[PDB]
Amino acid sequence: NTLKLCSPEEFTRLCREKTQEIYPIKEANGRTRKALIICNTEFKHLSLRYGANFDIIGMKGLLEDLGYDVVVKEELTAEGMESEMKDFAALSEHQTSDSTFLVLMSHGTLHGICGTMHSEKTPDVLQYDTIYQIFNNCHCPGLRDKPKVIIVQAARGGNSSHVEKDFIAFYSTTPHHLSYRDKTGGSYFITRLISCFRKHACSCHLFDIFLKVQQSFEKASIHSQMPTIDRATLTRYFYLFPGN
Structure with a gap:
């Protein structure tokens, strides 16, 4: 429904009692949190991803309610996805932010996400591996020691050096499986992720929220x-302290 807010009190208490178990948070005054959504809907050779727009609009609304200004780029090739993520990684505003979310929504293979031109004769796949090199500690100084949260909405095979740290990836399904949409076309993963954030971001850290999303897929198969x-x-722990 609406994003429920953490009291200033509960914010200040947790940042004081658990200072070394929590990612530090910037207060919203000079804060410039940034988030990226990449979504491909139409394809040169693959089925249309009807309903993807519902997922964009729902997740842009979630991120904004959590204080992120959301960049949305759509219908990219793999080369274009690579280019946008590098441009996004280099943004000044990460310096005055405490975290990021990368939301990727397209057709998928086992180890990558498909661009608009992908086919088995004309492969156009961005390896998930490449995301980690673009945003790691070496190549994205603005997000060092800050949580980089990757949300992936895709099938996972159903299409018929220096330190890496502070990453988490939440895929909509398991390897070799598909993701499903309701009769209106909205992704179940996205729909339940949003509502789970809206109820519990005020009092739960990120991993606890992810787990509640996974519990819902056990309770409601x-x-x-x-x-x-x-x-x-x-x-x-990554707490969002919504409203602070």
């Missing part, structure tokens, strides 16, 4: 779809 936490290297 959707075929074999099970959101998956992947390649997680967070070193502290």
